[PDB]
């Protein structure tokens, strides 16, 4: 049984608890009320057992894909945010923390891939995939390869996959139809069938991963990577000098990357339901609660719209949410881990030829709507 009277978060041991905790003492001194931040080890797996129980923190922070399996055993509770504060913030992030019609959760911050560049490789970055193979020749004449990035992982190749109509499931009114996906139609089928003629041509290995591909890039061996904010603070250290920007669009059409939201979430076993919805809509979505976290890490874009505008003066954050805002929310139903299995499996079976790239999404689709 979860206190009264008092406030206990969880969040993990990676983000900006101390400015969290900043945040909080100035709650306490507004109100009385203590607010106390913790960052236990595998909170994710913990918190389903102990709210199971009536106990656990008051709010949980955690992306929002694992929030729908919370909601489904009834472990979140419903939020209440008036249409004035709603429309502080950006309209697409409230579709990431809707359960079948409930909101359950405030969005927080804003996650998306982005093309990253080297600057002294590359002039101008490529707007379109079309033109990466005869770029890669050129390079190639120097030495260089034009793009490498992590293939072994869905999560890094679909934003191709998914430009010209690819989607993991049907999304409408805060509802996913989870017998219509997109794996196996046109759409993903020219992109799969791009990403394996690069394969093939050999402007890429598809034995690249993610450790691979960063090595590549931070030592100046590769003119662009596919990465996210949690990148960057080794590419500082690598001294390249880069950019940020919008991925290339294919047939003329944005690429889609998977768009991952930091999410807060109210305990439903909690007695203190009122006092979270304070300190979260007037204490930590503020500009002043924001930037308290922010300055003690980094959070990347923001949901909060007055804020982000401030933020975005850096080009890295811009880009990050200028490629989330053509990207595709990341499902929040139980049915995705399905799709990530399915959909590794017919990437690695392309790569690798030894499957073709029609019936290797023709078997995925089965695999996920069976």
């Given at each position: 049984?979860?206190?009264?009277?008092?406030?206990?978060?969880?969040?993990?041991?990676?983000?900006?608890?101390?400015?969290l905790?900043?945040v909080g003492?100035?709650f306490?001194?507004?109100?009385?009320?203590?607010?106390?931040?913790?960052?236990?080890?595998?909170?994710?797996?913990?918190?389903?057992?102990?709210?199971?129980?009536?106990?656990?923190?008051?709010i949980?922070?955690?992306?929002?894909?694992?929030?729908?399996?919370?909601?489904?055993?009834?472990?979140?509770?419903?939020?209440?945010?008036?249409?004035?504060?709603?429309?502080?913030?950006?309209?697409?992030?409230?579709?990431?923390?809707?359960?079948?019609?409930?909101?359950?959760?405030y969005?927080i911050?804003?996650?998306?891939?982005?093309?990253?560049?080297?600057?002294?490789?590359?002039?101008?970055?490529?707007?379109?995939?079309?033109?990466?193979?005869?770029?890669?020749?050129?390079?190639?004449?120097?030495?260089?390869?034009?793009?490498?990035?992590?293939?072994?992982?869905?999560?890094?190749?679909?934003?191709?996959?998914?430009?010209?109509?690819?989607?993991?499931?049907?999304?409408?009114?805060?509802?996913?139809?989870?017998?219509?996906?997109?794996?196996?139609?046109?759409?993903?089928?020219?992109?799969?069938?791009?990403?394996?003629?690069?394969?093939?041509?050999?402007?890429?290995?598809?034995?690249?991963?993610?450790?691979?591909?960063?090595?590549?890039?931070?030592?100046?061996?590769?003119?662009?990577?596919?990465?996210?904010?949690?990148?960057?603070?080794?590419?500082?250290?690598?001294?390249?000098?880069?950019?940020?920007?919008?991925?290339?669009?294919?047939?003329?059409?944005?690429?889609?990357?998977?768009?991952?939201?930091?999410?807060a979430?109210?305990?439903?076993?909690?007695?203190?339901?009122?006092?979270?919805?304070?300190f979260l809509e007037n204490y930590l979505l503020t500009?002043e609660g924001l930037?308290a976290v922010?300055?003690?890490?980094?959070?990347?874009?923001?949901?909060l719209?007055?804020?982000?505008?401030?933020?975005?003066?850096?080009?890295?954050?811009?880009?990050?949410?200028?490629?989330?805002?053509?990207?595709?929310?990341?499902?929040?139903?139980?049915?995705?881990?399905?799709?990530?299995?399915?959909?590794?499996?017919?990437?690695?079976?392309?790569?690798?030829?030894?499957?073709?790239?029609?019936?290797?999404?023709?078997?995925?689709?089965?695999?996920?709507?069976?």
């Open positions: 049984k979860i206190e009264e009277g008092k406030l206990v978060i969880w969040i993990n041991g990676d983000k900006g608890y101390n400015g905790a900043e003492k100035k306490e001194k507004d109100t009385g009320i203590k607010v106390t931040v913790e960052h236990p080890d595998k909170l994710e797996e913990k918190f389903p057992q102990v709210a199971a129980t009536g106990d656990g923190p008051d949980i922070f955690w992306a929002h894909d694992r929030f729908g399996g919370y909601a489904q055993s009834g472990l979140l509770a419903e939020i209440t945010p008036d249409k004035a504060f709603q429309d502080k913030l950006y309209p697409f992030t409230w579709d990431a923390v809707r359960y079948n019609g409930k909101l359950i959760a969005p911050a804003v996650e998306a891939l982005s093309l990253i560049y080297n600057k002294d490789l590359l002039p101008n970055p490529p707007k379109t995939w079309e033109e990466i193979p005869a770029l890669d020749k050129e390079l190639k004449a120097k030495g260089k390869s034009a793009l490498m990035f992590n293939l072994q992982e869905p999560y890094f190749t679909w934003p191709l996959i998914a430009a010209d109509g690819g989607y993991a499931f049907k999304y409408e009114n805060g509802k996913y139809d989870i017998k219509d996906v997109g794996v196996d139609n046109a759409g993903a089928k020219a992109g799969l069938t791009f990403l394996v003629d690069l394969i093939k041509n050999k402007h890429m290995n598809a034995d690249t991963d993610y450790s691979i591909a960063e090595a590549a890039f931070n030592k100046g061996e590769t003119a662009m990577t596919i990465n996210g904010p949690r990148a960057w603070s080794n590419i500082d250290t690598s001294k390249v000098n880069y950019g940020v920007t919008v991925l290339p669009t294919f047939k003329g059409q944005p690429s889609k990357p998977f768009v991952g939201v930091l999410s979430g109210i305990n439903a076993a909690s007695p203190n339901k009122e006092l979270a919805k304070e500009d930037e922010n300055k003690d890490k980094p959070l990347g874009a923001v949901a719209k007055s804020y982000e505008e401030e933020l975005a003066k850096d080009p890295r954050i811009a880009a990050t949410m200028e490629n989330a805002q053509k990207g595709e929310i990341m499902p929040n139903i139980p049915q995705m881990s399905a799709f990530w299995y399915a959909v590794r499996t017919a990437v690695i079976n392309a790569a690798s030829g030894r499957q073709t790239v029609d019936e290797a999404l023709k078997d995925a689709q089965t695999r996920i709507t069976k």
